[PDB]
Amino acid sequence: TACPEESPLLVGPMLIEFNIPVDLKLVEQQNPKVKLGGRYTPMDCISPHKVAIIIPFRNRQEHLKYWLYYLHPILQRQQLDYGIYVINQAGESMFNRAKLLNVGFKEALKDYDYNCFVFSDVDLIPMNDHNTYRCFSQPRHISVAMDKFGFSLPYVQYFGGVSALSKQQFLSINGFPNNYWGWGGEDDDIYNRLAFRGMSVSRPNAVIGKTRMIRHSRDKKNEPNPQRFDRIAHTKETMLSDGLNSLTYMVLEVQRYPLYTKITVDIGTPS
Ligand SMILES: O=c1ccn([C@@H]2O[C@H](COP(=O)(O)OP(=O)(O)O[C@H]3O[C@H](CO)[C@H](O)[C@H](O)[C@H]3O)[C@@H](O)[C@H]2O)c(=O)[nH]1
Ligand SMILES: [Mn+2]
């Protein structure tokens, strides 16, 4: 009973605004089919896409409210078999987005047999439901036309915002790097990994792949990392030593809310 290649539920372009007062109790009420932990499976058909949506997180509860409010209705319309994971970095030291994503990959798999992983910033919302949050033949870059970049790719190798890699694709590159502390460069490092393992980047066209980013200031412990340019230069040499095979972390707590699973983790500090 495979789901059609094109979901009959799709509406196309949508209005994304951040003025509305969002209330998770309401969102839960509006999305009665999504089960505890932000889990949903199509009732009338079998989706071949089993996706874990991973969101790196720390002190972004308000953005998260909006992300849930908008994506859950969307993800259901995309007829996907998915789960939402909020990887909350414990502590107040330097942020590490890429490491958190690795954690989400490992932790999601202990939950369900996901075959697909969508890594998404907490403040990015898609403007057209045809921009499917699933995996493809090649690593997929989803937020390809961001509002802050005038709805245009900043550079052909840009892989930030929202992306998706199948389980096999993620594994072939030894996951993402764990050694990028602070803002920047990890996406470029990941792009090097893909290219070096002979993969290419798949992208929806700019018409259907626009996203809005909730406006925000920079975070105190997520300052640009001055070592990024250098790390990008040596991805080839370091990728096999820094990623899944070297990932260490400690799960401090797990809470399953009706709309997502929150996993608080201690991922160490820069050293
Ligand atoms: O204190 C923090 C810092 C970061 N984040 C998470 O990290 C992502 C955000 O980084 P920012 O939004 O602060 O910065 P950018 O808007 O400049 O994000 C862009 O640049 C980053 C560079 O490191 C990533 O590549 C990201 O994927 C890309 O969209 C967030 O959306 C959120 O999911 C938190 O939750 N709390
Ligand atoms: Mn942002």
Swiss-Prot record:
Q: List the disulfide bonds.
A: C3-C45, C116-C135
State the UniProt keywords alphabetically: Cell membrane, Cell projection, Disulfide bond, Glycoprotein, Glycosyltransferase, Golgi apparatus, Lipid metabolism, Manganese, Membrane, Metal-binding, Secreted, Signal-anchor, Transferase, Transmembrane, Transmembrane helix
Q: What is this protein called?
A: Beta-1,4-galactosyltransferase 1
Quote the catalytic activity from the record: D-glucose + UDP-alpha-D-galactose = lactose + UDP + H(+); an N-acetyl-beta-D-glucosaminyl derivative + UDP-alpha-D-galactose = a beta-D-galactosyl-(1->4)-N-acetyl-beta-D-glucosaminyl derivative + UDP + H(+); N-acetyl-D-glucosamine + UDP-alpha-D-galactose = beta-D-galactosyl-(1->4)-N-acetyl-D-glucosamine + UDP + H(+); a beta-D-GlcNAc-(1->3)-beta-D-Gal-(1->4)-beta-D-Glc-(1<->1)-Cer(d18:1(4E)) + UDP-alpha-D-galactose = a neolactoside nLc4Cer(d18:1(4E)) + UDP + H(+)
Q: In which tissues is it expressed?
A: Detected in milk (at protein level).
Please provide, alphabetically and separated by semicolons, the GO molecular function terms listed in this UniProt record: alpha-tubulin binding; beta-N-acetylglucosaminylglycopeptide beta-1,4-galactosyltransferase activity; beta-tubulin binding; identical protein binding; lactose synthase activity; manganese ion binding; N-acetyllactosamine synthase activity; UDP-galactosyltransferase activity
The record lists the organism as Bos taurus (Bovine)
Q: In the Enzyme Commission scheme, what number(s) does this protein have? A: 2.4.1.-, 2.4.1.38, 2.4.1.22, 2.4.1.90
Q: Which residues bind UDP-alpha-D-galactose?
A: P56, F57, R58, N59, R60, F95, N96, R97, V122, D123, W183, H216, S217, R218
Q: Report the sequence similarity comment from the record.
A: Belongs to the glycosyltransferase 7 family.
Q: Modified after translation how?
A: The soluble form derives from the membrane forms by proteolytic processing.
List, separated by semicolons, the cofactors it needs: Mn(2+)
Q: Which Gene Ontology terms of cellular component type are present?
A: basolateral plasma membrane; brush border membrane; desmosome; external side of plasma membrane; extracellular space; filopodium; Golgi apparatus; Golgi cisterna membrane
> Where is Mn(2+) bound in this sequence?
D123, H216
Q: Name one GO biological process term.
A: macrophage migration
Q: In which pathway does it act?
A: Protein modification; protein glycosylation
Summarize which stretch of the complete protein this chain spans: 132 to 402 of 402
What is known about its subunit structure?
A: Homodimer; and heterodimer with alpha-lactalbumin to form lactose synthase. Interacts (via N-terminal cytoplasmic domain) with UBE2Q1 (via N-terminus); the interaction is direct.
Q: Give a yes or no for keyword Membrane in this entry.
A: yes
Which segments sit on the Lumenal face? 1-271
Q: Answer whether the UniProt record assigns the keyword Membrane to this protein.
A: yes
**EC top class, in one word?**
transferase
Residues recorded as binding N-acetyl-D-glucosamine, renumbered to this chain, are: G185, E186, D187, D188, R228
